[PDB]
């Protein structure tokens, strides 16, 4: 139900700006949704953005979302639907990924999300991710990967 979050917890300005791929989660969600692209524009503590997800019945849907960042945490709001709308805590910060944790409606007991800068991250990045997870009391063991976007390092 909880990780053991870091010492500092520092989340800097524009740090989330631009393009991400949500390829790994614990609760594996990649039956409910697939091929998640995020794009965020920074407006101080506010981000506004697009999430292009694929649905196993509906299409290539798109969603408008905004972050509101408060130090270690942010609030995530999606316009069209609200099952991932919750507070999320930053667990790890890296040039090639961020890890967040929350208790949204879709997983009240806890949801870990890895956002990658690359769609198919190289084995170096995965080894750092593995470290970040142990370092906050989760492990790649209980995470699923988005297999609809084949990646030899995420299998
Ligand atoms: C995953 O989503 C991406 C981008 O969100 C898809 O790429 C799009 O592919 C269509 C082809 O019909 C183009 O018209 C778009 O302009 C493309 N966008 C980009 C950024 O390339 C991609 O095809 C999707 N893949 C899966 C497996 O769902
Ligand atoms: C670098 C990460 C940016 C910050 C995003 C905040 C953390 C969690 C976002 C929740 C996304 C949940 C799923 C996305 C789309 C969907 O499943 O419908
Ligand atoms: C995002 O926008 C919503 C709707 O305008 C508003 O409730 C709030 O300021 C923002 N919330 C989050 C979670 O970013
Ligand atoms: C959805 O977005 C529109 C912006 O056109 C806004 O007026 C509406 O109240 C939003 N609400 C929800 C629940 O998504
Ligand atoms: C996800 O990726 C890692 C390799 O990066 C692997 O050890 C783990 O088993 C994968 N899980 C699934 C369910 O694909
Ligand atoms: Zn919690
Ligand atoms: Zn493969």
CATH architecture of the domain formed by 18-145 = Beta Barrel (2.40)
Q: Which of 21, 77, 27 is CA-nearest to residue 52?
A: 21
Q: Is the CB of 149 under 6 A from ligand 5?
A: no
Hey, where are the domains in the chain? Answer: 18-145
Experimental technique used?
X-ray
Q: How far is the CA of 54 from the centre of ligand 1 (A)?
A: 10
* Cβ-contact 145, 155 below 8 angstroms: yes
**Ligand 2: residue whose CA is nearest its atom 13:** 84
Residue 41 DSSP symbol: E
State how far the alpha carbon of 24 is from the alpha carbons of 13, 15, 19, 47, 102, in Å: 24, 20, 16, 22, 14
- For residues 116 and 84, give the distance between their C-alpha atoms in angstroms, rounded to a whole number: 18
Q: How far is the CA of 135 from the centre of ligand 4 (A)?
A: 39
């Amino acid at each position: 139900k909880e990780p053991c979050p870091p010492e500092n917890l520092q989340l800097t300005p524009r740090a989330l700006v631009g393009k991400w791929y949500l390829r790994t989660t614990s609760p594996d969600i990649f039956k409910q949704v697939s091929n998640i692209t995020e794009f965020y524009s920074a407006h101080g503590n506010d981000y506004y953005g697009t999430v292009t997800d694929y649905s196993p019945e509906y299409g290539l849907e798109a969603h408008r979302v905004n972050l509101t960042v408060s130090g270690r945490t942010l609030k995530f709001y999606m316009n069209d639907t609200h099952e991932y709308d919750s507070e999320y805590e930053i667990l790890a910060v890296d040039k090639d990924y961020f890890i967040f944790y929350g208790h949204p409606p879709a997983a009240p007991s806890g949801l870990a999300l890895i956002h990658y800068r690359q769609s198919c991250p190289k084995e170096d990045i995965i080894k750092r991710v593995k470290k970040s997870l142990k370092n906050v009391c989760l492990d790649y063991k209980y995470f699923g990967n988005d297999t609809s976007v084949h990646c030899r390092y995420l299998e």
